[PDB]
């Protein structure tokens with residue numbers, strides 16, 4: 001079934017490999033990569049690698065946008081972005097002496113007419129879809145609760161929304177009446193929402209947090225824990241998901257790869273345990289690869305056989 | 320009279336303003352500019368600001384190339400770049416706490432077929448031209464003797480060449496029988512060409528150096544010396560050029576602005592003293608501007624009155 005991905009603030013992700021960063025001087029290199037970037041494009045590329053049925057949307061502008069669109073065409077990734085006037089941004093990553101120093105731009109401003117054009121296109125796309133993923137931050141010019149209206153439109157077509165965002169843009173959805181089918185906060189994201197610190201073995205405290213009103217009406221909640229696996233909640237059923245050790249090359253974008261795996265699993269109507277395994281297997285495989293938003297499908301299939309899903313008992317067990 | 324500028328190694332110059340560069344973490348900014356860059360595009364923009372008749376050429380590739388062409392079009396700068404398949408590079412400048420931390424890319428590779436295409440275009444352009452400027456490094460794929468072929472072609476058409484390049488691409492031209500009309504090497508470049516140190520009493524050392532066989536047959540040699548003005552040689556005549564003390568904002572690209580001023584001056588048949596004043600006045604005006612490859616022509620005209628050209632004995 002068709003998965004639509006949404007990237008409201010894409011970028012050209014520029015990556016420089018340097019053995020030394022020298023301040024106040026010229027640094028030279030031929031080790032440069034320039035790739036379609038942004039959390040939602042990470043998701044798109046992983047779903048594509050898994051063999052899923054995907055189409056990418058969002059906004060792209062100018063010659064920088066035209067570059068992104070051409071690179072997706074060369075990879076045969078289906079696309080349906082809306083045009084805007086201002087230039088799509090660059091994101092700079094400098095890799096040096098085991099550091100990732102980054103420069104992130106604020107980016108283009110999206111106009112009122114451009115918002116309307118995007119939403120018209122979105123409505124047409126979701127009539128063809130079974131699942132939508134929505135990742136990352138809002139572009140300038142978009143209202144802080146813009147993701148509420150995307151979830152509202154998806155509900156009108158009975159489409160399942162997977163939402164991976166943070167800060168005000170997440171909080172505004174949780175405060176509103178239009179709930180996504182799935183959210184995937186990491187622990188720090190969860191700590192920031194609640195102003196709570198979690199300690200070792202956070203399972204009991206996470207269970208209590210996720211039963212609070214702010215999380216009501218969301219069918220699936222997945223709290224990813226990096227190398228330690230995940231905690232999840234499906235309605236009133238909690239799970240602990242345990243994963244094996246791997247040699248990570250670059251874990252950047254592993255959260256996005258987990259969203260891709262979950263979307264792929266939902267599209268094939270996987271039961272709870274297999275759904276969670278597809279999410280973990282994809283994040284793991286991403287972490288094994290040097291380049292971000294990419295998985296080796298053979299690593300993924302290997303990992304599926306070695307993940308343990310554990311159902312948690314309720315308070316009244318042994319009543 | 321028409322000036323054609325050559326830029327084989329252009330760029331999108333990206334300039335970031337930060338309060339502090341925090342390493343191994345994210346730095347966020349709304350203070351970003353993205354401008355057509357490369358030494359020869361600095362030259363082009365200043366000639367345009369001065370009021371000269373210019374057309375820009377070189378090679379542009381891909382979507383980054385199309386951005387540069389669009390920006391030149393918006394500024395009303397005539398252009399005739401040759402297309403290449405690989406993408407034109409970005410250059411990064413991070414400005415923080417009085418530092419300028421830069422990252423430069425090796426850039427695209429030009430194919431033999433694209434080289435042949437560029438050379439055909441260049442043949443056509445120089446028939447209408449009186450002056451040509453050649454700036455910066457060679458793009459990957461170009462042969463090390465590439466600028467010599469350009470100087471030869473200009474010689475055949477009686478076009479005066481201003482050549483501002485470095486290292487091997489400079490040495491090979493100066494070894495050959497087709498001499499440029501003007502060169503403008505700085506002290507760093509002069510040290511490389513001659514294998515000699517110019518740290519002690521540089522002005523006296525430069526005057527001796529310019530008499531060497533290295534530089535025979537070149538009508539004009541201009542050694543710009545930053546705030547210290549310049550020393551120049553026109554045939555057998557040496558000149559010292561004295562400039563007034565001024566407040567600089569950003570002196571980056573002032574060498575390119577000097578080349579622009581010299582090209583403009585030569586296009587209007589300026590006598591020796593006036594030519595040298597246009598060069599200095601453009602360089603000075605560039606250093607007064609925050610943005611690179613830009614001058615206020617009113618600053619330039621005022622500077623002309625306050626620069627003194629001094630003839631040296633012999």
Ligand SMILES: Nc1ncnc2c1ncn2[C@@H]1O[C@H](COP(=O)(O)OP(=O)(O)OP(=O)(O)O)[C@@H](O)[C@H]1O
Nearest residue numbers: 186224225226227229248253254255256280283284
């Ligand atoms: N070092 C690792 N070893 C094994 N698996 C990993 C590792 N890092 C990430 N993963 C896999 O990816 C999943 C998601 O990672 P994590 O919880 O760090 O995502 P995130 O914090 O949302 O990442 P990002 O924000 O960088 O996209 C993990 O639950 C796990 O299955």
Ligand SMILES: Nc1ncnc2c1ncn2[C@@H]1O[C@H](COP(=O)(O)OP(=O)(O)OP(=O)(O)O)[C@@H](O)[C@H]1O
Nearest residue numbers: 505543544545548567570573574577599602603606
């Ligand atoms: N800080 C400054 N203040 C005033 N004028 C300046 C300054 N820097 C440069 N200029 C003017 O511009 C001219 C050319 O600059 P300069 O001699 O520094 O070029 P350059 O050495 O070729 O520079 P680069 O090597 O960076 O290309 C100077 O001779 C002077 O007229």
